Amino acid sequence: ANKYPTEQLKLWGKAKELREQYYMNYARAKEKGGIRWSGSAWALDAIPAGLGEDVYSLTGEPYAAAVAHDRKFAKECMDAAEAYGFARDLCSYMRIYWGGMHLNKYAFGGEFPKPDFVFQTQICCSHSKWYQHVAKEEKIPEFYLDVGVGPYRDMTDARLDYVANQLHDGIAFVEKASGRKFDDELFIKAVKNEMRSTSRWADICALNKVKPAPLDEKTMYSLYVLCTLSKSSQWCADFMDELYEEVKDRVARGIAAVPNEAIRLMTDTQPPWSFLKIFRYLETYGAVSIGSLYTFALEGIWEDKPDGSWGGRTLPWDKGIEINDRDTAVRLYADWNLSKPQWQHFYDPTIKSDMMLRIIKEWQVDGVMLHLNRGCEGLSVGIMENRLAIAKSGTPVMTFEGNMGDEREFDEVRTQARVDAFMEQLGVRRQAASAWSH
Amino acid sequence: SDGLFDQFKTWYEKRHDYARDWKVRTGGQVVATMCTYTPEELLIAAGMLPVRVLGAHEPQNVTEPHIFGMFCPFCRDSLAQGLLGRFDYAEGVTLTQSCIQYRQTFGSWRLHVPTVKWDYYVPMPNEVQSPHARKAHYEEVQAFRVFLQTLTGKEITDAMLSDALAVCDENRRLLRELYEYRKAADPKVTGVEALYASLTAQFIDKREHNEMLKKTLAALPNRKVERKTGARFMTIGSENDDIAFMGMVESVGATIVIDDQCSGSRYFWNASKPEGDVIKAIAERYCDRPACPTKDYPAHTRFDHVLGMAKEYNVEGAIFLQQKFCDPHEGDYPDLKRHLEENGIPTLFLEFDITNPIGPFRIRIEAFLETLSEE
Numbered sequence: 069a070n071k072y073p074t075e076q077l078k079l080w081g082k083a084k085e086l087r088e089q090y091y092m093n094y095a096r097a098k099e100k101g102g103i104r105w106s107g108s109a110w111a112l113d114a115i116p117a118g119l120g121e122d123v124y125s126l127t128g129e130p131y132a133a134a135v136a137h138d139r140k141f142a143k144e145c146m147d148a149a150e151a152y153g154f155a156r157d158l159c160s161y162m163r164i165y166w167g168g169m170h171l172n173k174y175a176f177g178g179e180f181p182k183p184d185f186v187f188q189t190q191i192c193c194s195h196s197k198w199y200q201h202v203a204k205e206e207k208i209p210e211f212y213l214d215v216g217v218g219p220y221r222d223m224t225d226a227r228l229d230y231v232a233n234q235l236h237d238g239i240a241f242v243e244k245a246s247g248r249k250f251d252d253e254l255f256i257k258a259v260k261n262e263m264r265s266t267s268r269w270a271d272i273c274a275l276n277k278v279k280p281a282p283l284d285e286k287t288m289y290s291l292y293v294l295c296t297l298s299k300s301s302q303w304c305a306d307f308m309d310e311l312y313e314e315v316k317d318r319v320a321r322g323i324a325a326v327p328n329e330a331i332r333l334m335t336d337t338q339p340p341w342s343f344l345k346i347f348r349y350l351e352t353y354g355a356v357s358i359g360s361l362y363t364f365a366l367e368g369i370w371e372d373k374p375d376g377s378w379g380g381r382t383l384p385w386d387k388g389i390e391i392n393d394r395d396t397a398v399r400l401y402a403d404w405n406l407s408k409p410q411w412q413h414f415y416d417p418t419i420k421s422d423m424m425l426r427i428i429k430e431w432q433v434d435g436v437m438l439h440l441n442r443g444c445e446g447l448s449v450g451i452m453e454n455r456l457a458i459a460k461s462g463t464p465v466m467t468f469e470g471n472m473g474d475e476r477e478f479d480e481v482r483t484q485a486r487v488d489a490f491m492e493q494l495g496v497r498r499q500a501a502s503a504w505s506h
Numbered sequence: 507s508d509g510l511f512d513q514f515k516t517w518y519e520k521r522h523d524y525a526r527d528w529k530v531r532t533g534g535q536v537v538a539t540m541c542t543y544t545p546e547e548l549l550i551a552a553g554m555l556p557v558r559v560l561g562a563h564e565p566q567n568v569t570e571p572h573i574f575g576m577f578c579p580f581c582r583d584s585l586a587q588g589l590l591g592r593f594d595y596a597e598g599v600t601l602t603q604s605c606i607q608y609r610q611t612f613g614s615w616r617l618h619v620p621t622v623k624w625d626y627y628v629p630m631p632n633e634v635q636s637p638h639a640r641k642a643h644y645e646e647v648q649a650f651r652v653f654l655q656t657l658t659g660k661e662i663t664d665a666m667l668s669d670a671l672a673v674c675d676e677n678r679r680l681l682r683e684l685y686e687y688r689k690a691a692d693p694k695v696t697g698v699e700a701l702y703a704s705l706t707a708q709f710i711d712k713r714e715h716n717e718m719l720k721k722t723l724a725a726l727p728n729r730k731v732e733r734k735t736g737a738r739f740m741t742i743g744s745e746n747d748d749i750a751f752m753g754m755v756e757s758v759g760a761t762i763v764i765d766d767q768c769s770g771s772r773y774f775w776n777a778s779k780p781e782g783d784v785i786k787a788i789a790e791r792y793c794d795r796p797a798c799p800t801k802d803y804p805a806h807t808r809f810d811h812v813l814g815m816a817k818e819y820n821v822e823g824a825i826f827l828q829q830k831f832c833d834p835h836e837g838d839y840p841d842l843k844r845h846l847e848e849n850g851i852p853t854l855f856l857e858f859d860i861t862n863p864i865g866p867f868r869i870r871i872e873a874f875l876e877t878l879s880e881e
């Protein structure tokens with residue numbers, strides 16, 4: 069509604085095509101003798117990348133979210149996992165993934181492809197259980213990186229030793245499981261590309277601080293997802309650079325994702341698919357979601373910049389730090405991943421509370437809508453302490469209950485009524501503030 | 507009847523009175539501990555009384571602003587005890603890393619219990635199966651020792667650490683000796699009595715508790731058994747600290763002869779190995795302990811530990827007691843059930859809130875008993 073110019077993202081189609089190609093490459097991995105492996109989006113995927121350019125992952129949570137988009141298939145998958153005997157209140161992505169494996173159906177067509185091995189990161193308790201069941205049903209080798217060494221800000225040499233030494237076990241593991249010789253050059257390239265892509269995703273997010281926001285979070289769900297597919301690939305790092313050029317051009321031209329932008333919102337954890345239509349309704353109020361700690365830092369890697377603001381973490385070779393050998397690459401790679409903002413609340417919720425208050429400030433947020441996500445213990449721990457900290461700060465904040473993967477636990481009607489009440493609340497607050505300051 | 511375990515029952519019922527009086531008697535600090543991986547030897551060596559936070563199993567409405575209701579009854583019940591002031595005599599609070607839900611109890615407690623003077627989170631490795639976990643946990647335990655020495659201003663010497671480990675290992679060995687009596691055809695120790703002993707070990711001065719275990723074991727050889735054993739049950743779960751519920755189980759015509767739970771075997775099972783570096787002895791004792799589900803990967807070593815216990819204690823039926831929403835145990839449950847049932851041990855599944863009416867559970871246990879009596 070005529071306040072700002074708008075324009076559809078031109079790289080939209082390429083983001084969609086890269087994602088489709090990732091899933092098709094996993095399914096077709098064996099046509100030319102490639103390697104397939106599975107694990108979390110938080111797996112340290114440069115380690116399997118040392119085994120070649122034809123090493124294809126299937127990351128478990130983005131795949132499960134793709135099934136969740138197909139409500140009917142997701143229900144069938146969860147029904148199969150429940151039949152096996154798992155509790156329905158376990159992680160909804162894990163239950164979807166298990167059920168699709170038992171049904172032997174891939175969301176993109178064909179049988180569920182067998183992985184050659186599991187390579188996993190363990191920080192949520194369900195991270196082990198998810199792939200213990202998978203490795204047993206598929207009869208494949210399995211490796212787990214324990215990254216539970218506490219907050220990055222408290223890191224010690226010994227803590228970093230524990231993760232780095234495990235990664236060296238991981239190298240030996242993937243060699244054994246694949247039959248291939250690990251190549252230091254491919255590995256170092258994959259580390260550098262992961263550093264590029266995760267830092268560049270953060271840089272892109274940081275462009276959203278301006279008014280009008282060049283991106284809306286619904287659009288960003290198709291863009292942040294690439295790093296959850298293969299953050300260590302060349303294609304992902306190169307696309308993030310391309311994408312950054314386009315978003316920079318949007319900022320230069322005063323382009324808004326939402327042309328009647330008047331209200332800036334921040335969300336938190338991954339929403340159910342049914343919420344996306346609420347974002348569209350919110351636009352009739354001129355409300356845009358600028359992002360969340362989840363969209364910004366599930367894979368984005370950040371640092372404090374010279375002006376105190378939050379931006380993409382500096383690449384080590386831009387800081388004079390060389391990466392010329394395996395041991396140096398392993399330690400730097402462990403350190404890079406340990407700084408992930410979305411791992412800190414597993415130890416101390418106040419770290420996430422401070423992170424949310426900083427996003428509210430730097431991205432000029434007017435109101436916060438928190439998903440109390442019954443579908444994900446790992447990203448929901450501490451959520452009520454986060455709400456309290458935002459409540460005390462004086463920023464408007466509301467909650468709604470849901471489940472990102474199981475819409476049996478999401479009430480569309482009640483949630484839309486709560487979000488509409490919030491828009492009314494934001495209007496009332498604006499009238500009162502204007503009346504006080506005249 | 508003979509009242510042999512009455513001191514443990516008093517300690518459990520009057521745990522807070524005990525703590526306050528301990529402070530009067532010793533001048534020492536009390537530390538609220540969370541999860542059975544807390545390295546208690548360090549707290550004892552620092553002159554402190556570790557007391558494990560447990561729930562009250564009563565209705566409570568103080569935790570809703572702090573912990574979302576999708577999380578387990580235990581982490582919420584435990585936090586309520588802090589918020590309600592029932593651990594106001596505790597200067598410290600400490601958690602050793604395990605289940606992520608439990609970490610919320612710790613985080614809300616240190617932020618909102620106004621009598622907390624210090625806190626410490628120990629990031630014990632979860633992957634105890636890794637060849638690097640025992641070195642990493644050595645350094646965590648040494649770092650906690652340095653924290654405690656700095657906090658109290660008193661050097662915590664290797665001798666003080668060895669004397670504390672000796673008290674803890676003696677407690678572990680005495681609890682194992684007490685458990686040995688449950689293997690008999692007519693156990694001189696019931697499941698409830700064993701639980702009073704093993705639970706109070708977690709919030710009574712270990713020197714005093716060891717003395718009571720020694721008295722108890724001195725009596726057992728000549729203790730008359732009046733009750734009929736009935737079916738030989740095992741209980742399986744995470745904490746399993748509702749002793750009243752266990753008493754209902756044993757009143758239906760059964761005895762709980764062994765358990766896999768942190769109120770019991772999983773807390774004390776192994777004593778440390780003889781070892782000259784006391785920090786290594788302590789850190790490795792915990793890495794070597796039967797694992798929490800959270801710490802049990804890539805291998806499910808828990809499955810062999812649980813079946814081995816079941817066979818060694820001649821178990822006839824195994825009862826899974828599950829906290830609502832408990833992800834680590836929910837993740838193991840389907841295949842651990844199968845493992846037991848494939849090895850000849852029928853199982854029963856019961857699920858718990860903070861409180862539950864006991865009648866529906868009794869009916870289910872009576873029906874289970876019937877299944878055992880056929881085939």
Ligand SMILES: CC(C)(COP(=O)(O)OP(=O)(O)OC[C@H]1O[C@@H](n2cnc3c(N)ncnc32)[C@H](O)[C@@H]1OP(=O)(O)O)[C@@H](O)C(=O)NCCC(=O)NCCSC(=O)c1ccccc1
Nearest residue numbers: 076077080109110129130133134137287289290293296338
């Ligand atoms: C492909 C989906 C699944 C669907 O998305 P959609 O885009 O909504 O649906 P469509 O594909 O049908 O596209 C049609 C839409 O395109 C719009 N449009 C048209 N032109 C343009 C344009 N030029 N520019 C921009 N947009 C344009 C057009 O408006 C239309 O939408 P509308 O009807 O108007 O509203 C995508 O959202 C996605 O990948 N999400 C990520 C999910 C995932 O896998 N997540 C990772 C989970 S990892 C995790 O949780 C985790 C990891 C570790 C630890 C713990 C947790």
Ligand code: SF4
Nearest residue numbers: 159192194444445446
């Ligand atoms: S509960 Fe959340 S963090 Fe844990 S496995 Fe599931 S999606 Fe990941």
